[PDB]
Design a protein around this nucleic acid. Sequence first.
DNA 1: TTGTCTTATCAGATGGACTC
DNA 2: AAGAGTCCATCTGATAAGAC
Length: 96
Amino acid sequence: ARECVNCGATATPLWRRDRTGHYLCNACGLYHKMNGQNRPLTQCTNCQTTTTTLWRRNASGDPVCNACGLYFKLHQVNRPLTMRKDGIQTRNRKAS
DNA sequence: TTGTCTTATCAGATGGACTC
DNA sequence: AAGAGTCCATCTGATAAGAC
Ligand SMILES: [Zn+2]
Ligand SMILES: [Zn+2]
Ligand SMILES: [Zn+2]
Ligand SMILES: [Zn+2]
Ligand SMILES: [Zn+2]
Ligand SMILES: [Zn+2]
């Protein structure tokens, strides 16, 4: 399971990375990027989903999932119901 | 195999809750 | 009581995986 190399936290609203590529929680990531030293120690309007790694907002200011949000940004039309994928997907993102 | 397309997952911006 | 400095969830934007 993904662990922050600084504090050891396994839960966080947004995983970030250091220069070498290793993982930091949101709090450790912002601190080290800001300061340059280690840190001391709801559903979608469109598709009605309740599971997403990143919530976004539509023009009116309502919450939409990552997929629905990024889709409208690229189509100027809401994400159709017939595109909704089952379960969760993950990707091996490389560093650099 | 090639390119297109969707959208995970990274990074930066913002703003409210906090401390000095 | 008013301001600047600090913290960090939550937002927007960039990059790019990986299925089609
Ligand atoms: Zn951490
Ligand atoms: Zn490292
Ligand atoms: Zn959605
Ligand atoms: Zn399309
Ligand atoms: Zn600010
Ligand atoms: Zn690829």
